[PDB]
Design a protein around this nucleic acid. Structure first.
Lengths: 752, 482, 748
RNA sequence: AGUAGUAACAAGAGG
RNA sequence: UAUACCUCUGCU
């Protein structure tokens, strides 16, 4: 006999045993080298799908910009960028009729948000492209470095603090002919001991209009690591800091639309999405009659990003906002305009190897224009020749198509309007439809009397999709009678079934800290028992495996067990010294208290009863040096990446023990020319540290003020010292000292 | 945009569009569709980091000496149970490699193990070992301007993998991975006191799994991989320069209830200055085995085997002496791969959740804890294998181990090909299920999907086996249906 | 506080940071606070596995060098002088943390359990909570939004932020005074709770923010939806099992009041279908137990003014207030009555909406808060409303609430802005409350659409105008202001009331107050768990559970029932196990749905060859009712589940009742109920589908064009025709010449 | 050699 | 240039 597990599917339905199809217990595929090879392919495909469009050259950028919108209608099933504005404007109009006043109320909420929102808000989020240093940096630093140059130049309207005032500067910053920017530079020296030692300094450099404007409209590129369900690697992208600010409000407008739409799959979370789907199926059976055939197509759109054109989004924004004030329309219209004239930086570059010489070498992305084609292979050198046509300031202009998941929400609105068009009363045909859309994936449900009518409908959908740059993947998609379907990895079989294997990667050591990981790993089991149908015994096992994983990972083996590790020597000393053994946390080589019932209680609070008063005093000492509290909104927040998802921050419940510690930072930036940015951080963090002594509240609620940090502290110090004098317990000589010191500091301020 | 008013623009511009733009539904039928095109060429090779079915256990009963906790003193105790070492002799050539080095590495290892004292063992940097671990094989990094005009300067080989053919060894490996053994390999850490009635039922149900899983041979591989990779990661970080020796250990308990420490071989680590997750640490796998490599020469294409010794074995009837083979192999693993190797224990959950869901599916409708009447009341009513007669059925205990083995083999033979195949084959699996549910299924482009499925099937033995399993399923449906 | 000003002096002395302190504003400080050279960890699970192998992975404050020794007693290095990337922190060994916990400074932690009270409550609920037995059955989960935060003090994020700020940072609050009296109390309660408690304020703020504010999520729940039961969803329920449990501490009064109403409503609705309703209700009332406490003793003590509750109170002879609440105010019907008709209507927001409209003349007495009134109402018509109170605010608030209560076309067609009658997850909402909460925030559109009326000049009866003016000549249509208020307390007086066999509630005078028709069939989920210990009710109620348990019981005892179907079928129809199903069927259709079924069952008995056990099991519970003889065709039966009208098709598989031939199992609402025996069964002839007709395989073009089910009346007996039966299937049908009939064994 | 698979690792950087 | 050491870095 030869074993064959996929024979199970003879007896058990595929959906009921769908866990066995996912091989997510093994490692995922990583991209090793540079994404430049994939980026160029993306850039080529985007122009190739829009090839019949009208070319032009930009007045400011000087880049070749392909303009497919309102081009020739396609006459084949291949992916097309050739959309039609009059169709989109009919779809968006059709949405407005079907949902009356939806745009008004959604716009009015955005209107408030624009006037309300601070610059502070833009520090939140994923890495952005810092044009100051020509690389990806964390969102907070990109903003600070952008404001640094803006304020060093004449653009200081952002000093008010409100986001709209910062966005005012962004458009004015294009008016500078020569934008002065400070950049780091290395410098060798000789210091005795005799050592030849290096140091890093400053360098002022001016960028012309071309140099700045092209850097502002640059989207950086990387490869998508750990992407499951795929063979070949992908090319993900990252936005600049100028364009970032405007996209927020355009996505915020879209969110307020999508929240109120019946057929929108975003922005809703796991179970809410499952409910929102399950309800539209019942809505469909409510809407339809008894003598109608209902067919559910399990959709998926091909090259979703590359087809849809930012000029269509400009039409969508302008039509959705039609009626609102012209400042508000123009403000939201910025991001489509910036996307429509955008450029794309092509990664790090390429690496060459020499077999005879036995040496390797890295070549730059800018050097792809100035290089012989003998080094590259037939497939690559063909692409290098193509990309040279679009090359401007060492970057390729991607005027048509969207780069990556940036406009998701507003992109969904386009897809929803097509589902809206399928209303019985709007069509007045033998067929009609409804469904759900969530960016790239969608689920359609067509109803008619005979399969003639369903075929008639599916075509009417598919062709209408093509007319506005939506391209159904005929490979991946499939149709059947309403009853079973798939949607963003949720499997429906007369009701949504459990897919446990999707979550498996979460069942382990989260890698934040001892106290957190315990709270996470136990809640991961808890939540999977409710939603993903993790059965009692397997949940009991999950605890036993998670504890063993946790012990081996953190080297916190139970005090009695004879294993040779660095910690166990010091853990034995505690284990022997402690009276109550059950009082000790697993992190300090104690026993596992957990079981099904206990999972929702934190370890510290659970073992508090059995704890040693000496132990719990030291463990929960507020004066310990291991914990590092910074801000309330960031407290008790880990970061976890699931199997299918971009990036998630997860909350965890645990007591502030010594085990809540931060691990070491990456120190590779010491070697490189960015060594000063470490020193800047020391000054910035310690400047806030001292401010927080004067204003404790800044750790909880953000400190709102247009005045200076020093001026805020000095004004506090004077009044605090006077309140502590009059009523409080401070002497007249001690008061004088303070005020005199403040007076001296006020002079030392004015002297410089 | 503000002044626009619609005048059936979609309805007019739809008619003006060509008729070639259409989504025609090709009615799906399992009997009409073809089978998956398996790739042709040379036979596939054993790519796993350690030996699965073929490995030999140099075992010791119970604790002895100051070892147990210390890793090498376990391996010293295990080596002393075998006394039948010849002078090393090469009997299967690693065709591309300089095979004299492999013999010298084993001799230097066996010399160094004898000469060492203490806990850890760093081997001396000798030019035969340096070849095996790849010392100085990195080309030196330079500026482009420093070496512009070089004749043979090209980019790195950015080409697809070499296509391979399905072999019988990968199927047999799975058969053997599915089997039971007399050793309980998995040992679970402690749990809280069972207070809630559900926690007693959960424990009672967990005890039936504990037996069926812990005794399976897949667990032996899990515990092996866990030990190898956990030890290898910890060495890779601490001893970056040193060529450390790491033994291959799995501590277990017999069905009698007695302790045992088994030794499979040794792993000599290379230099581990790991920049990114994907960066590799080259190591030399040296593993004990009784199987002859010349009988299945294709399987061991990258291995160099040495006939190092001889021993006595008692057959069921007879008592026959046999020679032992040391499978030596230069290999490489990365932080990401050994990290997921450490976390292989979660392979149990993928199986046991799926098993438990099938029990709880019947428990609800039967209105009773079906836990015991599934395991205890033995009935062959789940199709898990295909024999020369037909499709053989097995029990919930067999299903557990079969589904465990898949979960393990997915972890061991982890690749982009599997990842891509699994996703695309699922769509066809769902179509078959939608047909068998009687939901008149259809596809817009069937043969385009087939191309996306077949694009993934290249050289990985596991992917090739799953691809064949899919055909075996596909025919098994077709025969039963029509 | 001299240290800090001497620290700032030294800060200002340095030119590099005095630049930053002067240049960067208090707005811009929030940007430079988050400025770091390091970026977020991509694969932390790996990076910790990696780093925990290193010698000095953890970072800690520079003052660790003061607090703990450099080398520990066993000879491990605890800390080093090498600083972390861009910090004053220094790299340390995990032996430092282990050292601290055994040898470090001991600290007082008596106040600690008060800060983390939210966590400690969970231990208290589990410790003092009691366990029961485990039941095994199809656990019918429902995707509803529920509370995750048991022991919350009902506050919004803004409301709680003020309260937290006033506790932890009282000196640095802005302009915001604590508006609510609830806030003022909590601020003082929480100040004395955490007095002289040494712990990081940052931690206290977070803990109070999490502790105070309501936090909700979508989850799959079966039965109990209270935050104390949501807490332990993983422990209470599974896929196939129900672990009985009640947590420690007393439950919330609002929840006990809520669940009582649902229990009472379920008991009343169950009793209406049975013979001798009063006895059924009495039987259920004595058996029923809410959260380990009998319903009878709860009904005695509870002050809950609700129709179905007052029916239960009347059977048990308890004091009764003939009233029901709405938008805070309580309504007591003085004169008249109304039928609860169901008619869909369009709003002014252009949205079709199926509403339950109350048709009939009624006089209500209304009270609550600082207001009170006498309402006189008809079918979508406010005749009169004499309102009085303490403030004009509370008078107008009630006026709005009554103008909503009227259900006039005037108010419906003045709905402006956004106002969907469905949840963010497309769930059916209560329209009356949605209208009310809309109009209580935005009145202006209603008031101007309402119109005005001339008032008679009577000294006392003033007028209220559409701009909130107290006018003496003009007023809003039917609205009158009572200058001396309205007399009350007689409203609240709990009456001694009688009840008949069929649950009509008669007052001591001898007049009807509450009828079973008035009880709303709002199939809502319960906060606390109801336990009916009755043979009449199922193990667990809820409309979805009824379908599964009814069809499961048929399959469970199918061999007993199949023989009872062939011989002596009237006893099978009048079995007491099919009664709870009848509550799912609309009250009007019950009679005609059973009659349509019985004839199809007798057609199956008459015609030889046609015998479909699946079609019997599907339609069997619809038969359990006194039938009507009216000949009308049905392509499907409608069922009301949680308001949603789900249609079960007669022929073939449906959403409600599915039979998957691959599995060989009946799937009711996405849940397997059982397997039936069908090897020899199945033919081209179908009997039990159309009344007085037989389907004979697929359609044939040489019997004319296809027809609809409505067109079947124009056909001779013996004649054939093609019919579009259902799910796009065209089939050949024959009108049988004979007829079928059965006499029942029941009365009225 | 080897890992690996559309591009890399086989240490990188510095006196 | 070559061989030695010595210093920094292990997501930058």
């Amino acid at each position: 006999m030869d074993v064959n597990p996929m024979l199970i599917f003879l007896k058990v339905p595929v959906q009921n045993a769908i866990s066995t199809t996912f091989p997510y217990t093994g490692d995922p595929p990583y991209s090793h080298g540079t994404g430049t090879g994939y980026t160029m392919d993306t850039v080529i495909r985007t122009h190739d799908y829009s090839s019949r469009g009208i070319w032009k050259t930009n007045s400011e950028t000087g880049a070749q910009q392909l303009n497919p919108i309102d081009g020739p209608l396609p006459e084949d099933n291949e992916p097309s960028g050739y959309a039609q504005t009059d169709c989109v404007l009919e779809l968006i109009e059709g949405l407005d009729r079907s949902h009356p006043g939806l745009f008004e109320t959604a716009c009015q909420e955005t209107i408030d948000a624009i006037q309300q929102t601070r610059v502070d808000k833009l520090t939140q989020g994923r890495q952005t492209y810092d044009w100051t240093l020509n690389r990806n940096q964390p969102a907070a630093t990109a903003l600070a470095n952008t404001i640094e140059v803006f304020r060093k130049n004449g653009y200081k309207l952002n000093e008010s603090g409100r986001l709209i005032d910062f966005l005012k500067d962004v458009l004015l910053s294009f008016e500078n002919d020569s934008m002065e920017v400070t950049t780091h530079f290395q410098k060798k020296k000789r210091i005795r001991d005799m050592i030849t030692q290096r140091t890093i300094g400053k360098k002022r450099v001016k960028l012309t209009k071309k140099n700045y404007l092209i850097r502002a409209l640059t989207l950086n590129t990387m490869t998508k690591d750990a992407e499951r369900g795929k063979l070949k690697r992908r090319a993900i992208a990252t936005p600049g800091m100028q364009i970032r600010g405007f996209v927020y409000f355009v996505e915020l407008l879209a969110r307020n639309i999508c929240e109120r739409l019946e057929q929108s799959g975003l922005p809703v979370g796991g179970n809410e999405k499952k409910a929102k789907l399950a309800n539209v199926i019942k809505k469909m059976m409510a809407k339809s009659t008894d003598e109608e055939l209902s067919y559910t197509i399990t959709g998926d759109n091909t090259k979703w990003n590359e087809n849809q054109n930012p000029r269509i989004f400009l039409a969508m924004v302008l039509r959705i906002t039609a009626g609102q004030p012209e400042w508000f329309r123009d403000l939201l219209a910025v991001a489509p305009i910036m996307f429509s004239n955008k450029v794309a930086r092509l990664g790090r570059g390429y690496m060459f190897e020499s077999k005879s010489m036995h040496l390797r070498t890295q070549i730059s992305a800018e050097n792809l224009s100035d290089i012989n084609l003998r080094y590259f292979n037939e497939d690559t050198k063909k692409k290098i020749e193509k990309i040279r046509h679009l090359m401007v300031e060492g970057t390729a202009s991607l005027s048509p198509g969207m780069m990556m998941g940036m406009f998701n929400m507003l992109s969904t609105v386009l897809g929803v309007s097509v589902l809206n068009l399928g209303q019985r009363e709007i069509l007045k045909r033998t067929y009609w439809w409804d469904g759900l859309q969530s960016s790239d994936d969608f689920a359609l449900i067509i109803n008619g009397h005979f399969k003639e009518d369903i075929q008639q409908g599916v075509n009417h959908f598919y062709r209408t999709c093509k007319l506005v740059g939506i391209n159904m993947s005929q490979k991946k998609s499939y149709i059947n009678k309403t009853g079973t379907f798939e949607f963003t990895s949720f499997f429906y079989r007369y009701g949504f079934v459990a897919n446990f294997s999707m979550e498996l990667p979460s069942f382990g050591v989260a890698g934040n800290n001892e106290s957190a990981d315990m709270s996470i790993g136990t809640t991961v089991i808890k939540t999977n028992m409710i939603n993903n149908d993790l059965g009692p015994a397997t949940a009991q096992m999950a605890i036993q495996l998670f504890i063993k994983d946790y012990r081996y990972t953190y080297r916190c083996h139970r005090g009695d067990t004879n294993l040779e590790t660095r910690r166990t020597k010091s853990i034995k000393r505690l284990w022997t010294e402690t009276i109550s053994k059950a009082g000790l946390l697993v992190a300090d080589g104690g026993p596992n208290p957990y079981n099904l019932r206990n999972l929702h209680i934190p370890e510290v609070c659970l073992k508090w009863s059995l704890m040693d008063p000496d132990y719990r005093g030291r463990l929960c000492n507020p004066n310990n040096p291991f914990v590092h509290h910074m801000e309330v909104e960031s407290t008790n927040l880990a970061v976890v990446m699931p199997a299918h998802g971009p990036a998630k921050s997860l909350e965890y419940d645990a007591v502030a023990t010594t085990h809540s510690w931060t691990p070491k930072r990456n120190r590779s930036i010491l070697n490189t020319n960015q060594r000063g940015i470490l020193e800047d951080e020391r000054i910035y963090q310690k400047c806030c540290q001292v401010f927080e002594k004067f204003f404790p509240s800044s750790t909880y609620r953000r400190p709102i003020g247009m005045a200076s940090m020093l001026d805020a502290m000095l004004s506090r110090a004077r009044i605090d010292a006077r309140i502590d004098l009059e009523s409080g317990r401070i002497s007249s000589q001690d008061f004088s000292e303070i005020t005199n010191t403040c007076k001296a500091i006020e002079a030392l301020k004015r002297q410089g | 945009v503000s002044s626009f008013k619609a005048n059936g623009n979609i309805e007019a511009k739809l008619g003006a569009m060509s008729e070639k733009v259409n989504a025609q539904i090709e009615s799906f039928d399992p009997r009409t569709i073809r089978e998956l095109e398996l790739p042709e060429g040379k036979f596939c090779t054993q790519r796993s980091k350690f030996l699965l079915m073929d490995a030999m256990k140099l075992s010791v009963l119970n604790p002895a000496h100051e070892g147990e906790g210390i890793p090498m003193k376990d391996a010293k105790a295990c080596l002393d149970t075998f006394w039948g070492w010849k002078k090393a002799t090469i009997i299967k050539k690693h065709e591309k490699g300089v095979n004299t080095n492999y013999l010298m590495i084993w001799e230097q290892l066996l010399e160094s193990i004898k000469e060492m004292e203490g806990k850890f063992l760093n081997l001396k940097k000798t030019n035969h070992l340096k070849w095996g671990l790849g010392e100085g094989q990195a080309p030196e990094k330079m500026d482009f301007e420093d070496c512009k005009e070089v004749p043979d300067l090209f980019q790195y080989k950015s080409e697809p993998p070499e296509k391979r053919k399905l072999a019988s060894w990968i199927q047999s490996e799975f058969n053997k991975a599915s089997e039971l053994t007399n050793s309980n390999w998995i040992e679970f850490d402690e749990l809280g006191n069972d207070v809630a009635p559900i926690e007693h039922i959960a424990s009672r149900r967990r005890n039936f799994f504990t037996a069926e899983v812990s005794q399976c041979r897949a667990s032996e591989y899990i515990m092996k991989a866990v030990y190898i990779n956990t030890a290898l990661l910890n060495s890779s970080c601490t001893a970056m320069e040193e060529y450390q020796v790491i033994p291959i250990i799995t501590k277990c308990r017999d069905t009698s209830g007695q302790r045992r420490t088994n030794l499979y071989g040794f792993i000599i680590k290379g230099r581990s200055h790991l920049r990114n997750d994907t960066d590799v640490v080259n190591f030399i796998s040296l593993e004990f085995s009784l199987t002859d490599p010349r009988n299945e020469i294709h399987k061991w294409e990258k291995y160099c085997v040495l006939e190092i010794g001889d021993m006595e074995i008692r057959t069921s009837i007879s008592t026959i002496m046999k020679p032992v083979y040391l499978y030596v192999r230069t290999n490489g693993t990365s932080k990401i791969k050994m990290k997921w190797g450490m976390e292989m224990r979660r392979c149990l959950l993928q199986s046991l959740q799926q098993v438990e869901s099938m029990i709880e599916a019947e428990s609800a409708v039967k209105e009773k804890d079906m836990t015991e009447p599934f395991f205890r009341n033995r009935e062959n009513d789940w199709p898990i294998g295909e024999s020369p007669q037909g499709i053989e059925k097995g029990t919930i205990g067999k299903v557990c181990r079969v589904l465990l083995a898949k979960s393990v083999f997915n972890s061991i033979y982890a690749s982009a090909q599997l990842e891509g195949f699994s996703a695309e084959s699922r769509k066809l699996l769902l179509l078959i299920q939608a047909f068998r549910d009687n939901l008149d299924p259809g596809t817009f482009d069937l043969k385009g999907l087939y191309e996306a499925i077949e694009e993934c099937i290249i050289n990985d033995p596991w992917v090739l086996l799953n691809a064949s399993w899919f055909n075996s399923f596909l025919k098994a449906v077709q025969l039963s249906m029509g | 506080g001299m240290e800090r000003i001497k620290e700032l002096m030294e800060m200002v002395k340095n030119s590099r940071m005095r630049e930053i302190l002067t240049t960067t504003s208090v707005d811009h400080m929030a940007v430079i606070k988050k400025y770091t050279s390091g970026r977020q960890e991509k694969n932390p699970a790996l990076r910790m596995k990696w780093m925990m192998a290193m010698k000095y992975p953890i970072s800690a404050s520079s003052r660790i060098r003061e607090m703990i020794p450099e080398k520990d007693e066993d000879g491990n290095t605890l800390w080093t002088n090498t600083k972390d990337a861009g910090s004053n922190r220094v790299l340390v060994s995990p032996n430092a943390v282990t050292w601290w916990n055994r040898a470090g400074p001991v600290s007082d932690v008596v106040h600690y359990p008060r800060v983390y009270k939210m966590y400690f409550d969970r231990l208290e609920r589990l410790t003092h909570g009691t366990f029961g037995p485990v039941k095994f059955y199809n656990q019918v989960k429902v995707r509803k939004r529920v509370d995750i935060n048991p022991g919350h003090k009902d506050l919004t994020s803004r409301e709680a932020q003020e309260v937290i700020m006033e506790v932890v940072f009282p000196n640095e609050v802005g302009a915001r005074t604590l508006s609510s009296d609830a806030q003022l109390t909590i601020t003082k309660e929480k100040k004395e709770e955490l007095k002289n408690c040494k712990i990081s304020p940052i931690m206290v703020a977070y803990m109070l923010e999490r502790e105070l504010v309501r936090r909700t999520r979508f989850l799959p729940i079966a039965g109990a939806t209270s935050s104390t039961y949501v807490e332990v969803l993983h422990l209470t329920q599974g896929t196939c099992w129900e672990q009985q449990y009640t947590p420690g501490g007393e439950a919330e009064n609002d929840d006990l009041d809520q669940t009582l109403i649902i229990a009472s409503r379920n008991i009343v609705r169950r009793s209406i279908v049975a013979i001798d309703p009063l006895a059924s209700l009495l039987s259920m009332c004595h058996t029923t137990s809410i959260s380990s406490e009998p319903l009878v003793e709860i009904l005695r003590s509870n002050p809950t003014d609700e129709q179905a509750v007052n029916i239960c109170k009347a059977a048990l002879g308890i004091r009764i207030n003939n009233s029901f609440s709405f938008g805070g105010y309580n309504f007591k019907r003085v004169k008249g009555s109304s039928q609860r008709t169901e008619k869909a209507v369009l709003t002014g927001n252009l949205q079709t909406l199926t509403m339950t409209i109350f048709e009939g003349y009624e006089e209500f007495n209304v009270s609550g808060k600082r207001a009170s009134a006498v309402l006189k109402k008809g079918a979508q018509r406010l005749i009169q409303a004499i309102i009085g109170g303490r403030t004009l605010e509370d008078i107008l608030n009630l006026m709005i609430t009554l103008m909503v209560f009227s259900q006039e076309e005037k108010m419906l067609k003045a709905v402006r802005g956004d106002l969907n009658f469905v949840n963010r997850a497309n769930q059916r909402l209560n329209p009356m409350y949605q209208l009310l909460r809309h109009f209580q925030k935005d009145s202006s559109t209603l008031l101007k659409n309402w119109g005005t009326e001339e008032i008679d000049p009577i000294m006392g009866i003033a007028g209220i105008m559409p701009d909130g003016t107290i006018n003496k000549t003009q007023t809003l249509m039917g609205v009158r202001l009572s200058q001396g208020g309205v007399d009350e307390y007689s409203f609240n007086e709990r009456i001694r009331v009688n009840i008949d066999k069929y649950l009509r509630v008669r007052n001591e005078k001898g007049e009807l107050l509450i009828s079973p028709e008035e009880v709303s069939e709002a199939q809502g989920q319960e906060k606390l768990p109801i336990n009916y210990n009755s043979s009449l009710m199922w193990e667990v109620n809820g409309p979805e559970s009824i379908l599964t348990n009814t069809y499961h019981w048929i399959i469970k005892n199918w061999e007993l029932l199949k023989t009872q179907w062939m011989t002596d079928p009237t006893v099978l129809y009048n079995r007491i196990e099919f009664e709870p199903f009848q509550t799912l069927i609309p009250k009007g259709n019950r009679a005609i749905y059973s009659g349509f079924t019985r004839t199809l069952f007798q057609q199956m008995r008459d015609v030889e060859g046609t015998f479909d056990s699946i079609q019997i099991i599907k339609l069997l519970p619809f038969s359990a009712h006194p039938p009507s003889l009216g000949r009308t065709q049905f392509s499907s039966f409608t069922l009301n589940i949680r308001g949603a009208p789900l249609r079960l098709l007669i022929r073939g598989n449906s959403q409600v009742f599915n039979y998957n031939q691959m599995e060989n199992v009946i799937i009711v609402l996405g849940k397997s109920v059982g397997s039936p025996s069908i090897l020899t069964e199945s033919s081209s002839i179908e009997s039990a589908v159309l009344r007085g007709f037989l389907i004979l395989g697929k359609a044939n073009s040489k019997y004319g064009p296809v027809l609809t089910i409505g067109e079947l009346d124009k056909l001779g007996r013996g004649e054939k025709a093609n019919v579009l039966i259902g799910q796009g299937d065209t089939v050949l049908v024959m009108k049988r010449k004979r007829d079928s009939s059965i006499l029942t064994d029941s009365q009225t």
